[PDB]
Every structure is written in structure tokens, then in C-alpha cells.
Design a protein around this ligand. Sequence first.
Ligand SMILES: CN(C)C(=O)COc1cccc(F)c1
Lengths: 156, 39
Amino acid sequence: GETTDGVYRVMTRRLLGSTQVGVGVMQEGVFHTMWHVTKGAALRSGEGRLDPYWGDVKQDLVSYCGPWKLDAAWDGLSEVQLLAVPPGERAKNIQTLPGIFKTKDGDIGAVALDYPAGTSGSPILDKCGRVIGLYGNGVVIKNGSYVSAITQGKRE
Amino acid sequence: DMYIERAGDITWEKDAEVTGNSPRLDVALDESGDFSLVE
Ligand SMILES: CN(C)C(=O)COc1cccc(F)c1
């Protein structure tokens, strides 16, 4: 199937019509998305099959065809871009300064942008166009607005 | 049965729309991968 690097929609025919359940990144021949988008199921790309290779429910991440390849990190100071891919709509870049999620195990960047659930897996990028994490695992705060963690894996 | 469809290139775009605030939140991450606000 299509193995060109880039951002892809993840679709299903199991619900009414064709429904976008999420988004992912193809890089170095590996497909990267959030675990909650696919639940670890195999994926189709044209006539080709992509099998899961690594995944972790707690990190909420999964890679297909090979190990997780994305290793850039938010520098903690600069603005980033969410490359949002909403259901039925064109890919669009949104620039923002991340906030922070503070946890007992360390701090993580967070992006306060509101998109539908099927946008999960959309990439967050630095100024070199490197993917510093995926959007779509987060919380709802004291006003109803969505705040996503900048979720990044580990490149072994 | 899930399938993927290309949506674009991964590139930083000059003159992208600029928005969103930068909140600092105390959160907890459970074994199921769910985040919750700590107050
Ligand atoms: C009221 N709003 C804007 C939201 O809470 C949207 O929820 C979301 C957004 C993205 C991914 C996801 F998994 C869920």
C-alpha cells in the first residue's frame, strides 16, 4: 500500500458509512498512532496490511511495521504547530504555545486546542517539522475546554 | 476493518493561524492511560 511519509487518516467501515476514528504518522516505513484509535488492530493500506509491532496502553501509543521512530521533544520554550486532521476536513496547521501537565513522574507539554475525538493521533511539530508527539490523550478542565498532552514515545 | 488514507505532508507552515492558551495543570495518569486533574 501507500508507504510515503506523511500524516494519514485512520478510517473504519464498522460504524455508519466510513468514519474517521483517528490520525497517524508514517515515518521511516513505520505507522505511528494512539492506542485508543486502533485498540491494537491490524490496518489496511490499499491492498496491503500493516501489523502492530509495539504498543502500550498506559502511554496510549502504538507503532505498525517496526519500532517507534519519533524521538524529537518539545524544548519547553517555543511555540509548536498542531497539524490537525479533523474528520471530513482538510489538514490544517495551528500554531500555539504549549502549557504543562505536572505529574508525580515529571512534567509534559500540553496543547489547549479543541478538536473532535476523530482528530486523535494528529501530530504536533517543532520549527524543523519534526514530530514532538501526538495529540488526543488529555483532560477537560474547569470550563469545558480540552487540553491534550504532547504524547511522545521512546525510540529504542 | 480499519484502513488509512493520506492527508498531507508533515511540514511547519509559516503564517499558520496562532491560537490556544498555555495552562499549567497538576494531573495524574492511571494504569488505563487516562489522565485526570489533581486539585
Ligand atoms: C469539548 N472538547 C472540545 C473536547 O473535549 C474534545 O474532546 C477530544 C478532543 C480531541 C481528542 C479527543 F480524544 C477528545
